[PDB]
Amino acid sequence: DEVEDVLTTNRIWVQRTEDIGIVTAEEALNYGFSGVMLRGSGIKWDLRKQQPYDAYNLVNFDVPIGTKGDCYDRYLCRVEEMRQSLRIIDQCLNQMPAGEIKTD
Amino acid sequence: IIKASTGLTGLAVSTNPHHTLSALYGKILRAVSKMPQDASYRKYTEQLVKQRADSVAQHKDITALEKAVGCGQVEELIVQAENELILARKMLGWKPWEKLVQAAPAKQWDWPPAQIM
Amino acid sequence: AVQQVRPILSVDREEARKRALNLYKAWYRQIPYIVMDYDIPMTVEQCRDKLREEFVKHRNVTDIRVIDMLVIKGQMELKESVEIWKQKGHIMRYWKESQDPKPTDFLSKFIQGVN
Amino acid sequence: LRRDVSPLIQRIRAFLLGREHNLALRFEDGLADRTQPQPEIPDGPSHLLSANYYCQRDGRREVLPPIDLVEQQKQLAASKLPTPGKVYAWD
Amino acid sequence: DKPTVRQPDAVARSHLSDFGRYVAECLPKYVQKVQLTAGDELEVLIAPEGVVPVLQFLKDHHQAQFTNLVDIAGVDVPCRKNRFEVVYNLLSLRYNSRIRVKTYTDELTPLDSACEVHKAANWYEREIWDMYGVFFANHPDLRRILTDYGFEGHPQRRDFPLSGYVELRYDDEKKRVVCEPLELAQEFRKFDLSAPWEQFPNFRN
Amino acid sequence: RGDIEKVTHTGQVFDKEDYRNARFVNAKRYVNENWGIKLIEEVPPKECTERVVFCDGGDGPLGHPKVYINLDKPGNHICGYCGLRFVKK
Amino acid sequence: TDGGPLDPKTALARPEELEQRNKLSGKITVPTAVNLSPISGVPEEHIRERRVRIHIPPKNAMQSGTDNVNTWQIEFDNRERWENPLMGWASSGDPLSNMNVQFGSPEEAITFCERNGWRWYVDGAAKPKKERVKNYGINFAWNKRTRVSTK
Amino acid sequence: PEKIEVFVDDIPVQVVPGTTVLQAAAQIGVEIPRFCYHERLAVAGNCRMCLVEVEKSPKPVAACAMPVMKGWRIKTNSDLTRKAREGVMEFLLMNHPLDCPICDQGGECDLQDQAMAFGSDRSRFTDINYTGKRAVEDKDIGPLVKTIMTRCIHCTRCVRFASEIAGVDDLGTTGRGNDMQIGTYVEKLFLTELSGNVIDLCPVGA
Amino acid sequence: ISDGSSRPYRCKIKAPGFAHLAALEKIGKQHMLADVVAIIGTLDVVFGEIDR
Ligand code: SF4
Ligand code: SF4
Numbered sequence A: 001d002e003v004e005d006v007l008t009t010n011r012i013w014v015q016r017t018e019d020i021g022i023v024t025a026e027e028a029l030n031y032g033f034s035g036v037m038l039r040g041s042g043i044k045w046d047l048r049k050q051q052p053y054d055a056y057n058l059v060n061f062d063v064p065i066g067t068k069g070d071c072y073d074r075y076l077c078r079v080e081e082m083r084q085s086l087r088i089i090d091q092c093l094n095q096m097p098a099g100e101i102k103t104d
Numbered sequence B: 001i002i003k004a005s006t007g008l009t010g011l012a013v014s015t016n017p018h019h020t021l022s023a024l025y026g027k028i029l030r031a032v033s034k035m036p037q038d039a040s041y042r043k044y045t046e047q048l049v050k051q052r053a054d055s056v057a058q059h060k061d062i063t064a065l066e067k068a069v070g071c072g073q074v075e076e077l078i079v080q081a082e083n084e085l086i087l088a089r090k091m092l093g094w095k096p097w098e099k100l101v102q103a104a105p106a107k108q109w110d111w112p113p114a115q116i117m
Numbered sequence C: 001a002v003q004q005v006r007p008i009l010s011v012d013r014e015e016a017r018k019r020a021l022n023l024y025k026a027w028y029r030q031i032p033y034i035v036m037d038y039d040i041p042m043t044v045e046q047c048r049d050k051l052r053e054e055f056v057k058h059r060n061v062t063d064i065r066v067i068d069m070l071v072i073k074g075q076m077e078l079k080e081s082v083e084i085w086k087q088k089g090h091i092m093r094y095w096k097e098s099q100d101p102k103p104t105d106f107l108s109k110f111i112q113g114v115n
Numbered sequence D: 001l002r003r004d005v006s007p008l009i010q011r012i013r014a015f016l017l018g019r020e021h022n023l024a025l026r027f028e029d030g031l032a033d034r035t036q037p038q039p040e041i042p043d044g045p046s047h048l049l050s051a052n053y054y055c056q057r058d059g060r061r062e063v064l065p066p067i068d069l070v071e072q073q074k075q076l077a078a079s080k081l082p083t084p085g086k087v088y089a090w091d
Numbered sequence E: 001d002k003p004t005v006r007q008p009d010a011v012a013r014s015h016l017s018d019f020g021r022y023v024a025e026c027l028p029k030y031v032q033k034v035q036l037t038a039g040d041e042l043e044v045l046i047a048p049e050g051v052v053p054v055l056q057f058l059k060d061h062h063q064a065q066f067t068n069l070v071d072i073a074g075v076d077v078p079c080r081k082n083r084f085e086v087v088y089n090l091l092s093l094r095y096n097s098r099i100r101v102k103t104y105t106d107e108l109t110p111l112d113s114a115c116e117v118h119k120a121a122n123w124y125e126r127e128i129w130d131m132y133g134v135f136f137a138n139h140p141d142l143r144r145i146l147t148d149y150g151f152e153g154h155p156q157r158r159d160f161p162l163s164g165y166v167e168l169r170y171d172d173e174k175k176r177v178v179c180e181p182l183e184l185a186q187e188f189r190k191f192d193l194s195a196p197w198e199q200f201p202n203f204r205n
Numbered sequence F: 001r002g003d004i005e006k007v008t009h010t011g012q013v014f015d016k017e018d019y020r021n022a023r024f025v026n027a028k029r030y031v032n033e034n035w036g037i038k039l040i041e042e043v044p045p046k047e048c049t050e051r052v053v054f055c056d057g058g059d060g061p062l063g064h065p066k067v068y069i070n071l072d073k074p075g076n077h078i079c080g081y082c083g084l085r086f087v088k089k
Numbered sequence G: 001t002d003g004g005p006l007d008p009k010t011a012l013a014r015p016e017e018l019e020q021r022n023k024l025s026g027k028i029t030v031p032t033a034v035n036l037s038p039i040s041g042v043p044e045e046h047i048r049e050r051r052v053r054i055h056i057p058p059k060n061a062m063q064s065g066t067d068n069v070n071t072w073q074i075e076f077d078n079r080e081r082w083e084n085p086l087m088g089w090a091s092s093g094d095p096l097s098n099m100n101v102q103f104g105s106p107e108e109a110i111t112f113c114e115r116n117g118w119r120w121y122v123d124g125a126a127k128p129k130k131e132r133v134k135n136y137g138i139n140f141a142w143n144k145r146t147r148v149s150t151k
Numbered sequence H: 001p002e003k004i005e006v007f008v009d010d011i012p013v014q015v016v017p018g019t020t021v022l023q024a025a026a027q028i029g030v031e032i033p034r035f036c037y038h039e040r041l042a043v044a045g046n047c048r049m050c051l052v053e054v055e056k057s058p059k060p061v062a063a064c065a066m067p068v069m070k071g072w073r074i075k076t077n078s079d080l081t082r083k084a085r086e087g088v089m090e091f092l093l094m095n096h097p098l099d100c101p102i103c104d105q106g107g108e109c110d111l112q113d114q115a116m117a118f119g120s121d122r123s124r125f126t127d128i129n130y131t132g133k134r135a136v137e138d139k140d141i142g143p144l145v146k147t148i149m150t151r152c153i154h155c156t157r158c159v160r161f162a163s164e165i166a167g168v169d170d171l172g173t174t175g176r177g178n179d180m181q182i183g184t185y186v187e188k189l190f191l192t193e194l195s196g197n198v199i200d201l202c203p204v205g206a
Numbered sequence I: 001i002s003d004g005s006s007r008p009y010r011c012k013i014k015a016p017g018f019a020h021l022a023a024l025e026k027i028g029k030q031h032m033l034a035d036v037v038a039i040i041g042t043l044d045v046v047f048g049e050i051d052r
């Protein structure tokens, strides 16, 4: 909250990030983009939800999607992945079973 | 009644999606009508684009068309139809319906490869 | 024997010879811009003699695909020398300026070491 | 108990932050003990000594060479079009 | 049940089986063999001359929208007649799946570049040019991307040694970083970890 | 300096005519004063009654793997891991 | 064909460019004996000096398993190793001394060595199998010297 | 003479009628595990590792010394064959000392490789805590050999090598049962121009 | 990909930043120098995985 109070609302950060480095979604698909650079351009694609692995499907979270595709949307997407990672950390601290740590 | 945005940059909204989809589907039929009838790709593309053309002609609303097709939003349907039109133009020259251009070499697809056998 | 393969940039030997001569012409034009820019202790005539020796040690090959692969690699070194894309430490690697030469007679090879 | 500024500077900091302030710095009272009792890791599903054999638990031997699908259809054979998976709308 | 053994997906197996037979029906000329490996992954072994249309088909068909090409991997097998093999890994977002398209290439035989289909290959085949040394025809920019500028040979070829052929040091009579023949201070101790008893009876056939 | 001419427990010392003693004019030679042989023969052998005995290093899980030594042969039987000597009267 | 828009880089190209694209799309006749020594990037000294041994690897005599015997392999001739004067390791100036390349048949390794221009030789051929009869009744025999004295 | 047909691992193969199960198995390519079968020595049935299940039989057969007949279907990768191998070598490994880091045969020991392939994953031996495994004294067999008789698995390869190929009969099998020791009865030296091969013929490295 | 032995036959690592640095040529074009500096950051790209 303190880091976002300094960085996110500022006019210099907006003028240095917004409408800069705009990548279209068909260029993102054709050039083989993955992750936040897919998610910042409006494409709803997170590998933790579509093809789940290693108990991501017993925990619940939100997938942040950008709109414009510039630097500001990707920065806000990274901060929202930070907060949803805090949510998944909360759920994993809430429930864990007692048992072995490795395969037998 | 119009979509404000697609939620997806690089693709603006379409003023007349139905006529663009119908024109692309008619051009796909015109490109596939030159294919031989024994080729299975012609039959599969004709079945696909006939089903999609019946879905476009049956539904006049945009979001009803997007729900009835079920693939996605209608601009991505225009993108898919354009890509399949480019494919149907290219596969007349690529000539896929014939036999194998190159036979299998000896021990080409054997794993593990170091065995005597 | 006989084999039907896809060619690389040339069908017969004459086109590959023309591409090798085009490499020699382009390297000849690129040598005086290499000398004045790269800060190397080699005279232009020594650079052209080294270019001649690099072509001479590849005169012996006969296969057109091998010749055209050599043409492609020489064009890559030319493109890495038109744009500077390199340092002076890598340009002098053709001359082998740091390796002390080894004798070829059997007595000196017997005296020095088993190699 | 914990080292901080006097509450006048704390109220000045809470006014300038725009929110109530929780201490970012860790303390010995808020953390767990460095010396803990010695733990016992429980056994897994197949440390039972009676029932298990390795032949029913060997995942490395249950793999197979990859299946030629045209040959499999030819051996086992003697509507909507086939999709690679479920349709997901990323639009 | 069996908690140690990994449980596969039956519906993914059925969907990839139907799509693999669909691909083998659609392109009888270029598709050589369609297989479905363990772990629910489809491998479409193709002819070299079908390197460019099949991916284009997998870019542009309505049941094959493999929009992302995530990487191209090269495997060097020296025992085969055509030495290298080239593996294209494609991801479909619409149908939420992956496919592998495998082809074979000699040390001198070209491959037609997939840069007209997928632009990510604009560097990826360059890596296959640098690591293995296969020429990609109709490439917009084919250069060495990962190795040295004065480097000779291709590293991840199995004929190339692990430690290379040359080393670099600094030399004061030339005031330059110079190139010397390779001498290790301690050699790479090769360990013989070959299995003397076979473990998997299903892979000898 | 006597650490240059000192012999380690592996029986290694550099000769007086060797050039490799020129590395020790600025850094002293490290010879371990605790030889394992002397500190393993300082430990007296353990007298046992049973025909076979078990050794585990004297620490449990922190020692060596547990091995069984036969004591029917007369003499001192040496554990191959830790060097402890057992004897049966 | 299709009545759509034609490709502009093929219609507007010169007849010399149409002949250039069709000749590279064909198949040329080459000899199958191809020397690839200048292409592989090996220094010429290792080409003219090193000798390559194609062999089936020896079975470990203390072990009954023959799975590691089941391949052929290429290995390079052992050069001089030495002790470094600092600390006592085994320094070696041979870059190719640590490379064993697996192969299925000696003909494949011979063609690979002719491709890469190495000076190749085969140490030994494939071992023929001799039919030896083994059964338990020979151990207990009547007027035979093969009667066992153990057990 | 004629060749009889046997179906080894559901693969038909024509064999000489004097051949056993293991020779037909090595003919088709499959390696049946062994500890006492050496092809230059006499056959024996004492390690019991080579048990395979043939069809319409109540008990598994030892593949090293059971000659084949016409119409047999031998299943090497069967469930009963793997269960028999795991049980037999679990019996082999209940009394083996924990000497692998101080054993020179380790890294090429037959018992380690045959535990990693066709072996169990964990020891079922509860009695390591109390009334534990055996230990036998070392015999001064010679100055060329180093004998640790606790690691011996009683496979009788050295005794067959002495009485068959080496010629002298100094090696022997003393004792009865679990206290059986494979060594000379007195403090003797086993001397032959061929004692080094005994180190080759010991599968465990006693 | 594995040949069944103790070692992997070939392991290829797909760098997430490889395609991003590939499309840097189109994304960063017609921009300011300071705009190129921010763009390089916006693609996340440590070059250990890119260089492999
Ligand atoms: S005989 Fe084999 S299993 Fe036993 S201690 Fe030696 S290496 Fe280990
Ligand atoms: S000493 Fe070795 S060869 Fe002799 S019976 Fe024991 S394990 Fe077998």
Ligand code: FES
Pocket (backbone or CB within 6 Å): H033, H034, H035, H036, H037, H044, H045, H046, H047, H048, H049, H050, H062, H063, H064, H065
């Ligand atoms: S190998 Fe058959 S019982 Fe020993």
Ligand SMILES: [Zn+2]
Pocket (backbone or CB within 6 Å): F055, F056, F057, F064, F079, F080, F081, F082, F083, F084
């Ligand atoms: Zn001990």
